[PDB]
Design a protein around this ligand. Structure first.
Ligand SMILES: C[C@H](O)[C@H](O)C1CNC2=NC(N)=NC(=O)C2=N1
Ligand SMILES: [Fe+3]
Length: 308
């Protein structure tokens, strides 16, 4: 049989009912494990994602002073690096995010405003997500230019560290790239490649995503920069990834897709994308080798996936 996959953007709503119910915030070694207030705060954000439905505006939340502080620290220390470490598409859009979305040290931007802004850039939109989606559902959203975005923030005791995605990582890491046309199309190709795809291949697509969307390096003229969200949201690894220590290889999907990695230390290896259009092409070609007895196309006019 062929695994189920949403045919319309509205059907993404089926995901919030298929997430991991026991999140990392419940682990003993989580920075906020002993903090019951944090625990309730997380549950509150999880309830917002749980009751969200496609088409609804995303609930605004008044962030506590302590939370705004954690964001300030992460924002200020990371910002100093972008001008020289982030790829062009990132820097080109960051100022706009600053003027129209409240990207500032003393303010945590609201997902609704960020979503509207991405919509006018590339049609990308966000939807609040409770916790970790399966790779199949997470990647599936991308086919509709939809990004499941966390809304809670890491625990204030360790501002420069998070064992999971949190809002600082979504906004400072992912958002600027989804504002770029080429990147938008490239990430969508990954989404399209995953629809109705067999599990073993979903894993391959997750690995490609890891080495591009999360930890990718781009070729910029004769230089190299970071575009991977996991890098753009990690002060330490962002500086390291452009140093002489890591090993760099050109993005090559048959190899990238089976390359192991661990999410615990700095990556020993990075793949360099020639450009987003090229990575997009490479995914399309790679998608062609996936055994699916059909083809898929997203029609932005109706927000439906066409199955051939
Ligand atoms: C895309 C790849 O499978 C990643 O490991 C995943 C899986 N599920 C996910 N779920 C959520 N909510 N956010 C993510 O960034 C995410 N990334
Ligand atoms: Fe991420």
């Amino acid at each position: 049989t062929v695994p189920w996959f949403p045919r319309t953007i509205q059907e993404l709503d089926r995901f919030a009912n298929q997430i991991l119910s026991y999140g990392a915030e419940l682990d003993a070694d989580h920075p906020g494990f002993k903090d019951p207030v944090y625990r309730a705060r997380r549950k509150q954000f999880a309830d917002i994602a749980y009751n969200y439905r496609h088409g609804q505006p995303i609930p605004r939340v008044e962030y506590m002073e302590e939370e705004k502080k954690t964001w300030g620290t992460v924002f200020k220390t990371l910002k100093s690096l972008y001008k020289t470490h982030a790829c062009y598409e990132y820097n080109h859009i960051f100022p706009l995010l600053e003027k129209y979305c409240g990207f500032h040290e003393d303010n945590i931007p609201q997902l609704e405003d960020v979503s509207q802004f991405l919509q006018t850039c590339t049609g990308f939109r966000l939807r609040p997500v409770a916790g970790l989606l399966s790779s199949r559902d997470f990647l599936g959203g991308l086919a509709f230019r939809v990004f499941h975005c966390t809304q809670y923030i890491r625990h204030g005791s360790k501002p420069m560290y998070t064992p999971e995605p949190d809002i600082c990582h979504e906004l400072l890491g992912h958002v600027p790239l989804f504002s770029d046309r080429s990147f938008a199309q490239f990430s969508q190709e990954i989404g399209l490649a995953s629809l109705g795809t067999p599990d073993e291949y979903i894993e391959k697509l997750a690995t490609i995503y890891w080495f591009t969307v999360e930890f990718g390096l781009c070729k910029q003229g004769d230089s190299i920069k970071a575009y991977g969200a996991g890098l753009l949201s990690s002060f330490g690894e962002l500086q390291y990834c452009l140093s002489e220590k890591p090993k760099l290889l050109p993005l090559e999907l048959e190899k990238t897709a089976i390359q192991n990695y661990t999410v615990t230390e700095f990556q020993p290896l990075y793949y360099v994308a020639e450009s987003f259009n090229d990575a997009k092409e490479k995914v399309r070609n790679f998608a062609a080798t996936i055994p699916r007895p059909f083809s898929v196309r997203y029609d932005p006019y109706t927000q439906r996936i066409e199955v051939l």
